Amino acid sequence: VYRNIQACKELAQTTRTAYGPNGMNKMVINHLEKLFVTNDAATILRELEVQHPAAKMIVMASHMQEQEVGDGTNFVLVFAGALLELAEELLRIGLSVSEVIEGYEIACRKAHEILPNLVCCSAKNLRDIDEVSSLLRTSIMSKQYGNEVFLAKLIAQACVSIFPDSGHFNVDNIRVCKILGSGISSSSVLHGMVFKKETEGDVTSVKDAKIAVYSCPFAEELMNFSKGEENLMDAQVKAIADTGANVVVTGGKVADMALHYANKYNIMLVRLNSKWDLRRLCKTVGATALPRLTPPVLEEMGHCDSVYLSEVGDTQVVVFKHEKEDGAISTIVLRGSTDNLMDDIERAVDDGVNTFKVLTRDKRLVPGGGATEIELAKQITSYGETCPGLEQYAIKKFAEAFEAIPRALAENSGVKANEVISKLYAVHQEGNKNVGLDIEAEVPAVKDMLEAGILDTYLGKYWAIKLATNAAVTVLRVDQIIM
Amino acid sequence: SGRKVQSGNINAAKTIADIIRTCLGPKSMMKMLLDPMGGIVMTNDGNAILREIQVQHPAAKSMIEISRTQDEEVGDGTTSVIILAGEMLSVAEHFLEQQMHPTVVISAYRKALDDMISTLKKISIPVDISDSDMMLNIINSSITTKAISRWSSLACNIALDAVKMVQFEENGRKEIDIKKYARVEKIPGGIIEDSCVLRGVMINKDVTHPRMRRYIKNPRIVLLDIQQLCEDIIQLKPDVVITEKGISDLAQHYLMRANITAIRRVRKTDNNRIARACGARIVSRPEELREDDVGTGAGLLEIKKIGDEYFTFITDCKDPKACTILLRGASKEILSEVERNLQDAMQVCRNVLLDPQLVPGGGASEMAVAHALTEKSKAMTGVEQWPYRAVAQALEVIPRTLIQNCGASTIRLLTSLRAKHTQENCETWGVNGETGTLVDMKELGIWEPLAVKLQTYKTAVETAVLLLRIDDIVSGH
Amino acid sequence: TGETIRSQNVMAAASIANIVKSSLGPVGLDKMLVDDIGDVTITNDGATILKLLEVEHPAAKVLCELADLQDKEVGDGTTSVVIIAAELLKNADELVKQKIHPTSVISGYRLACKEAVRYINENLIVNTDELGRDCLINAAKTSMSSKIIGINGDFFANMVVDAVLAIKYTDIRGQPRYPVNSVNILKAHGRSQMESMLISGYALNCVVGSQGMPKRIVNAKIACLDFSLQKTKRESDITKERIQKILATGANVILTTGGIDDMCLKYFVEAGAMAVRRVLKRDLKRIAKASGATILSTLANFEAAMLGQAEEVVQERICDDELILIKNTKARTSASIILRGANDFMCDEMERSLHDALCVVKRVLESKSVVPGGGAVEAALSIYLENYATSMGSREQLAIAEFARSLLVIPNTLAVNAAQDSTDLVAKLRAFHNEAQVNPERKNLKWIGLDLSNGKPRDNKQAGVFEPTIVKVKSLKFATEAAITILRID
Amino acid sequence: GTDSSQGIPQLVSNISACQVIAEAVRTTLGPRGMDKLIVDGRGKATISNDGATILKLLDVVHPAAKTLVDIAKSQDAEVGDGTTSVTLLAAEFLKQVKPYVEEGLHPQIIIRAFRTATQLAVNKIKEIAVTVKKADKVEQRKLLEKCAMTALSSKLISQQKAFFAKMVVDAVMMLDDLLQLKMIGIKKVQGGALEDSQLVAGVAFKKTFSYAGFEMQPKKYHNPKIALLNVELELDYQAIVDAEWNILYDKLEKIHHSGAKVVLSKLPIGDVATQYFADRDMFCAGRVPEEDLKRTMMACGGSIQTSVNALSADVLGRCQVFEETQIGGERYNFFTGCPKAKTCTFILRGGAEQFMEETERSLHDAIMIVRRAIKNDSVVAGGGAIEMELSKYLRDYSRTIPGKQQLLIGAYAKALEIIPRQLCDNAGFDATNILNKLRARHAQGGTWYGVDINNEDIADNFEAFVWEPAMVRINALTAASEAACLIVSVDETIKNPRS
Ligand SMILES: Nc1ncnc2c1ncn2[C@@H]1O[C@H](COP(=O)(O)OP(=O)(O)O)[C@@H](O)[C@H]1O
């Protein structure tokens, strides 16, 4: 039993250092020898060889937390490790393993109703670009560097604010065309599906287009074989060019007589598609995957509207746009020098836009950064002495676990945790809810979080304090496996 | 090194505490010790365990040493100080693992100490002065669950007369009591009812040829440590002059010429009690031999052959501060325990002379200071808050060990006890040491006196701050 | 393995300071000092820790005597002269590993200490003058901080600086001396410490000699003795004839340290004298030297003029205590604050806080040239010797900075022992002493040091936290003397 | 036997790993840096003094070393030289911040202090930046020739380096379209004195057996161009000889029909068949380098061919003139006279063989220095004077700021000082005197006192025209700080093997 919660403690400790906006990034040289200098907990959890079975419940609860808000994973891990760390103290006091379960359940049910009573929600809409750019600041502020978020919150928001329309949203439409080279300031916004191409013979102002679909990319007897191959690729590009295609796509490289054919019929020779856009370009234009050059027809065809060349990001790229939604797809172009920061920027983008998605359905915003956690830590520990019996222990061991969350925010910022926790707990008694932990001060100084703007989603905390408690309870109710 | 050997200090202090943890209270489990020779000895008394036991660590030695200073002042409870220091020292390391200094910990411990000395005086119930019924209740609380329960009916009187004959009116009204002037004489032979009290000092020794002008109706005792000086004495003419060496019968007649009675082979616990009961003095230098020579002492000398023994009673004395208590019987195993527990009770009724307060023990005083310090912990902020609260709940092992060694569970019992102590503020309930049930200790009657438990709590806090003050033992191992 | 015996000596000398590091300052911890005979030792000061330590390494044994050479000058500073010299060895070994010769580091240290004392002698204080008194007031308030005297301790501070300066002895060379046992503790039962007052003499709480002496018996000639004036049977019957032989010589206030005279109060209206039992020698000798008297065990013999001067012996009630008012004497060895309270036991730590204030006030009085406390001299010197080092350009240039980086260990230690983080306090002292140099208008910003009780930046010239300049100067001399020897040893 | 995978052991292992890879490139800093020899393993001896030429050919096994060698790879893509300086500076940042970490200070604090110190330094470098453009550098160009003189000043080569300075300013000025190392090659010629060198306006290549066919080609020709062929030219048992004879016939007739002056190929032509492929009736060439392939197509413009009688429009199209001359005795290829002339090749006419190494160490940065002094004008001094001024500024900024960063910014300060300390150690002087006498008059007199590489005494590199580009130093110390805080921010390295 104690070995299980010890495995949960070390699983909490390996992600506690990567918590908050000053998370220490870890190095991943994985099974197939990657190289990630990364900070997101779901990236590390999907790489770590979780061998102990009791920690797999914690990993699965964090994965379920990822599956519906996209964030709050490290919060679930830290809170569950804190609950089990205080649970072993409760067990070594002399409480049963049953009593801690319903104590945690009662205090979690109390937290689930105290949590909507501290909200400072969003103002009017997920429109008004400059208002919701500040609302998306906290997500990438936690992940990437804070001084970088001032451009990055705008770049991540002005593209995602294209379609906050008719009460429905999709996060898959926000893509990234990862283009290397110039700095992060050179990043820009694009409206439609974008990737680089090679050639130039593009008809631009097309109607509802006719898109080629590729699921698989590319003495006189010698001259006769040459003419045979010549008319062979001619009939091949005609087998696409019949039924009137405007573009010819391929995942690979150019061919010289084939590009002369694509200039002869005036077709855009699209090249160099990824091993992931083969589904995504089919999804956006209504295309069905075709292996070779011979078997397209008019029924076997995609339908964009405007395919031409753009030079934003200082590089020639394609554009696919104006679908049934007429603005369904809206990628972003992310410019960096190397790749080892660009994966973190990419994993910050979607973790910003899923918070935008949960803001479509939950406008409630709680003050984050120690404000909510110390408030719950005070409320439940004031509830704890009210109900007598053995649960009076366990409820008081619940809210104290909430104090482990700003402590992990404290010690990740070079701050003495006991001083800042005592100071925050004292100032929360009178200078109420909206105060929390300041990051920038080396001195353990508190700061009001509402005027700082550092607020989190209410539904994320609401689901996270449910799933972490469920994980801790379902871990505490096992004894062993023969192993 | 440093905090590592500080943790080693508190570990070496805690291990000797859990050695003697279970053996407090009236249901004490017996700790057995073997030598590397074959001596197999079982006991309950914690001090008896502390005497033989060796410790390889100087921190544990000093922790033992301050309790060794504690034993000879107010008496027992020396297991309680070694217990109650250890939990504070163990709970201090949880903040020493929080990278906070020993200084904030010991200042929080001192801030708990000044609270604990006050809150015990809040819950102090006044016993009345020298009223024999609650004086019997003092015997009922302090002297029972021992081997005196068939002979405490005499010990209740032996307490009450001895405390009234060891008083000292130095700065005020009779305030200092003492246990070294009460003239105990524990001789076997006869029934234990022959153990009697009287005013004065008995002396086992006598002159070897008692054809002397020996007993005079107002013996004025001069001490000495020569017939020319015997001639020189007769300026003021005292009637007795005390030596310690042998007096021949010719020298006895020559002292009869002076009319003074000397004495031989007398002990020093005899001699200082002789001088204490009478106000003796000593001088033989002739220009210091003045009006200031003779200590006007007793009102009766008495050659008495008590138990065929050459007794001399210096009784009806000057100062009622060294007075007779005989101790008779068959063997010498229980009136020694009577003497021990009644010198502890002598300090008890010394407290009754000064602060006559009987606070409910059995952890009820401990639960009261615990609750009254937890509620005071709610207002205070700063880093010293958590250690200050820690000794709020580190010290409650006095019920927790006592509920441990009586069969009942500790968890539900202590949780229900604090449940009937926090919101039930004016109750002061304690765990009964027999059935393991939460009773009103005021209804049960087991009241520990205030000053002795104040001394134990203070000495425990001093032990804690002494150990945490220690940094390193670098002069050897 | 093992190499560079200089580094072996550096580690051996560094271990000695690592023992006595956390003991620096009044909030220092305790070092258990145990030989295997069984005995323990509980002590906080580096002097006896350095003395009774069974020291092992021979190169480290060069330290304990050189710091003992600090002991025979002023006493304390023995810990700091170990700590500073060990940090000098630590930085000097790092300089040695950069192929800088130990001769060059030693010559740089020898330039640095002379430049440091030249910097110190242009920035010390003599402001604690005859009219500079409130500095002594809050300097006494430093000795009684965080105590319950603090609301009456200003009223105590006025009377205690009036105690020490009025009792002051102009010595044989003219410099003022304070005998510490001259003014002494003296309890009074009854009302609390709100009313305790300095009396300009001693006033003994023993048996009353006489009301027969007048309210100001103008020439109190102290005919003190040791006998008890009791009759036996120019006297053998020792009550009168010796004291009458000296009494015709103008013996004004007879004192009998033993018993009283039998015809006492009748001789006490023609002489105006006393007979007080148990006159302790703390007050008997310090009324003898207060007046210039002679105590006569035997008296049969001159004895006219050597019964020294006092001006009046008052017979009144002082806080439920008629006292023996040996007061207004020839020399000022007679003063006592009548400690009103219950005993010397209810105000025991209170009279401790009243006595230690005297001996911490006396330190600035001897050798009136003074520097601030709180380690601010070391912070100012680290500011100083940095820019002094950057002017050199020789091979000693890296030495003096390693001098200046070493000296700030004394605020670095005191920040640790006062339960603070050691970085920010020393950094704040360095920042505050920057504008003591780089800003010409704020020259009155030098005196910011660490408070030894809390560990925070705080003025010391305004607060009285001071140190005699010869202590700082000679400790900085002897630290370099300890550094140069062990750096030469290889 | 030492196990180090906990957090403080993690960072200690990481900084030992950066220290060893810094020692792998420590001695190569500066113009006269010590050479390092590595092999491939099979006998391909490579002596190098460059950093990335060492570092790419080096091995790297460690995680933190791999996540700094990427920054090292990023620094060579700008200009090349300077990759050792940024890595050595970041390693000295880590070695100076070393004793503060295990004493108990937080890595995010020292990272933030590094960032603030970097922002302060990149501020202070901008104010001391001096432009030198209109002080007669392109018109009356001789002062820009003067910094062209800074490559080999006051040597026995310096008299010939007057001609080399004039020709390097010509090799920059005549071709400035953001010039590269590719557009200007150097060609070694044995024999003669070093003064007899040249800078030709075109390509230059020695001809060997498999290289080129026969002399007496149309040298003085109005428009001599190139066929760029990828087919060979060289020479059933009765039905296999006549087909080869016919192929010989049509490949002979291709030269008449297509009209190619010199056919170019990556395929061998027979010089044992010299007149036999002069019986191709024209010149040809084979086994071509890629610099010849570019600089005669991107600059001259010779078209590329495919078949038996492959005619094109640029086998005798517009180039200026052909040349084939005994330069130093040996006749060389010259498809000189390029209409798109980003091609002027240096012709190292000289006696000794290892002076090729001397010129490819000394004039391979002189092209960079001169084309940068044209490209950048806001420049600063070198020789470690700029790091010394930033170290003085940040030494002031440390003690004038309260808080724990004061010890770190000074740690940011002294860590700069190994940049000239490694320089003089690569020169040979004592670092201690050359640093102390530097810092004294640097803190008293002025800023741009720097370390001279020749006499090893403190000089004024601003007056010796030793210009360092301000933007290059900005990117250098920015990348040094970034590679510092990346390794400092790294604690955990999760492995998760195969098995
Ligand atoms: N600048 C900041 N100031 C205060 N708190 C912050 C800041 N940035 C992030 N946080 C807090 O860190 C907490 C954890 O976020 P994190 O777990 O890193 O998100 P994710 O689960 O997407 O990685 C959030 O609840 C947020 O309140």
Numbering used by the authors:
A (entry chain Q): 29 to 246, 262 to 526
B (entry chain g): 17 to 241, 274 to 525
C (entry chain a): 13 to 245, 266 to 333, 340 to 528
D (entry chain H): 12 to 246, 262 to 525
Q: Which statements did the authors publish about this structure?
A:
CCT is the most complex of all chaperonins with each of the two rings composed of eight paralogous subunits (referred to here as CCT 1–8). Each of the subunits of CCT and the other chaperonins can be divided into three domains: the equatorial domain, which hosts the ATP-binding site and most of the intra- and inter-ring interactions; the apical domain, which is believed to be responsible for substrate recognition and binding; and the intermediate domain, which acts as a linker between the other two domains. ATP binding and hydrolysis in the CCT subunits induce conformational changes in the CCT structure that drive protein folding. Our findings suggest that CCT contributes to mTORC assembly and signaling by folding the mLST8 and Raptor β-propellers.
We were successful at isolating human mLST8 bound to endogenous CCT from HEK-293T cells overexpressing mLST8 using a tandem affinity chromatography strategy without adding exogenous nucleotide. We solved the structure of the mLST8–CCT intermediate in mTORC assembly by cryo-EM to 4.0 Å. At this resolution, the structure shows an almost native mLST8 β-propeller bound to CCT in an unexpected position deep within the folding chamber between the two CCT rings, revealing a unique means by which a β-propeller substrate is recognized by CCT. The reconstruction shows human CCT in an open conformation with a prominent mass located in the center of the structure between the two CCT rings. The apical domains have a very asymmetric arrangement in which the eight subunits in each ring are arranged as a tetramer of dimers as observed previously for yeast CCT13. Collectively, these structural observations indicate that the mLST8 molecule is bound between the two chaperonin rings on the low-ATP binding side of the rings (the CCT6 hemisphere) through interactions with the disordered termini of these subunits. Based on these differences, all the nucleotide-binding sites were empty except the two CCT8 subunits, CCT6 and partially in CCT6′. Further examination of the nucleotide-binding pocket of either of the CCT8 subunits revealed electron density that is clearly attributable to ADP. D499 is unique to CCT6 and CCT8 and sits near the hydroxyl groups of the ribose ring at close hydrogen bonding distance. The mLST8 has achieved a near-native state while bound to CCT, suggesting that the complex represents a late folding intermediate that is ready to bind mTOR upon release from CCT.
